[PDB]
Design an enzyme around this catalytic site. Structure first.
Site, PDB file in Angstrom:
ATOM      1  N   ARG A 114      -0.320  30.164   0.113  1.00 16.99           N
ATOM      2  CA  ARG A 114      -1.643  30.819   0.176  1.00 16.99           C
ATOM      3  C   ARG A 114      -2.042  30.944   1.640  1.00 16.99           C
ATOM      4  O   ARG A 114      -2.421  29.930   2.230  1.00 16.99           O
ATOM      5  CB  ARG A 114      -2.629  29.999  -0.650  1.00 16.99           C
ATOM      6  CG  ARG A 114      -2.024  29.477  -1.941  1.00 16.99           C
ATOM      7  CD  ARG A 114      -3.010  28.728  -2.795  1.00 16.99           C
ATOM      8  NE  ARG A 114      -2.439  28.460  -4.082  1.00 16.99           N
ATOM      9  CZ  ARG A 114      -3.063  27.851  -5.079  1.00 16.99           C
ATOM     10  NH1 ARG A 114      -4.326  27.454  -4.957  1.00 16.99           N
ATOM     11  NH2 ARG A 114      -2.414  27.631  -6.202  1.00 16.99           N
ATOM     12  N   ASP A 134      -4.794  38.056 -12.289  1.00 14.00           N
ATOM     13  CA  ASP A 134      -3.550  38.693 -11.761  1.00 14.00           C
ATOM     14  C   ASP A 134      -3.822  40.129 -11.295  1.00 14.00           C
ATOM     15  O   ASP A 134      -3.723  41.058 -12.127  1.00 14.00           O
ATOM     16  CB  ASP A 134      -2.424  38.649 -12.787  1.00 14.00           C
ATOM     17  CG  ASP A 134      -1.845  37.275 -13.017  1.00 14.00           C
ATOM     18  OD1 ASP A 134      -1.929  36.400 -12.081  1.00 14.00           O
ATOM     19  OD2 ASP A 134      -1.269  37.090 -14.103  1.00 14.00           O
TER      20      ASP A 134
HETATM   21 ZN   LIG Z   1      -1.118  34.879 -12.671  1.00 14.07          ZN
END
Ligand SMILES: [Zn+2]
Ligand SMILES: [Cu+2]
Ligand SMILES: [Cu+2]
Ligand SMILES: [Zn+2]
Lengths: 153, 153
Positions: free
Chosen positions: B143, B83
């Site tokens: 994406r 992340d």
């Molecule tokens: Zn994540």
């Protein structure tokens, strides 16, 4: 345990392919998959040092060679870790890759994870050629397609 | 000592770019580079588990999550290793990437070598969106581009 990898090959021309890698513990690495768009005959097939596609296949650098040896065939004691020999296409331009190798690895010092797989214009002379080029690249000529070896499920 | 990696982002749309990574020993990973072709604003930016491009960006699988946590912003304690939060594109559609991260690495169990970097269509909500999806993807959506993270010189 059991490690898996995959590589999607792409280049400036029509050559493309998908290559799979599996290694059971400390065993051999089994390489498999298919390459399309090749001229009939043998094509050099190696792991190169750098997983760097910024300038196409040329930024992959030389053959993966952590023991600083001369180029050979996969069956030779004198070989680069990255030396996987030749793949063969017929009239349809399709190579079926089937290779077992005990020098490449999917973890540890000899890991090819994050390095580049390259398929070449010409046959790999397996280091038997009588020039410096044979001792570096097996006179395998230009890089047709490449990709970064990734971790697979 | 000093490990380097590089990632070439590609997808089906106009979104391109090159991301560089540097780590000195067990220190932070510094992410740098530019992404072009983006819509103005914030875009989710993560490391996904698999360096698998067989089905474009969708074979990368979920956020690299070796500690089995929920999604978060990079500043959060409860986050995925992968992340890296949000990048910001100007009018011109160019995002200048500059990130220092302590959870990713270029060796060891937290290594992102052979994994996939992904830039998303939407802002990442840092796991604060209050639906389950926020706790997985931060609702960053589809994406736009990806690349396998490779060893650089
Ligand atoms: Zn994540
Ligand atoms: Cu080669
Ligand atoms: Cu993502
Ligand atoms: Zn070689």
């Amino acid at each position: 345990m059991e490690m898996k990898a995959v590589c999607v090959l792409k280049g400036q021309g029509p050559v493309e392919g998908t290559i799979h890698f599996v290694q059971k513990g400390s065993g051999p690495v089994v390489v498999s998959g298919t390459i399309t768009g090749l001229t009939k005959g043998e094509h050099g097939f190696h792991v190169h040092q750098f997983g760097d596609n910024t300038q196409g296949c040329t930024s992959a650098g030389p053959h993966f060679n952590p023991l600083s040896k001369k180029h050979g065939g996969p069956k030779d004691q004198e070989r680069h870790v990255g030396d996987l020999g030749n793949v063969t296409a017929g009239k349809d331009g399709v190579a079926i890759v089937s290779i077992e190798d005990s020098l490449i690895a999917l973890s540890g010092d000899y890991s090819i994870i994050g390095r580049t797989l390259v398929v070449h214009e010409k046959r790999d002379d397996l280091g038997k050629g009588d020039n410096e080029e044979s001792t570096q690249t097996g006179n395998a000529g230009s890089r047709l397609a490449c990709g970064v070896i990734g971790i697979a499920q």
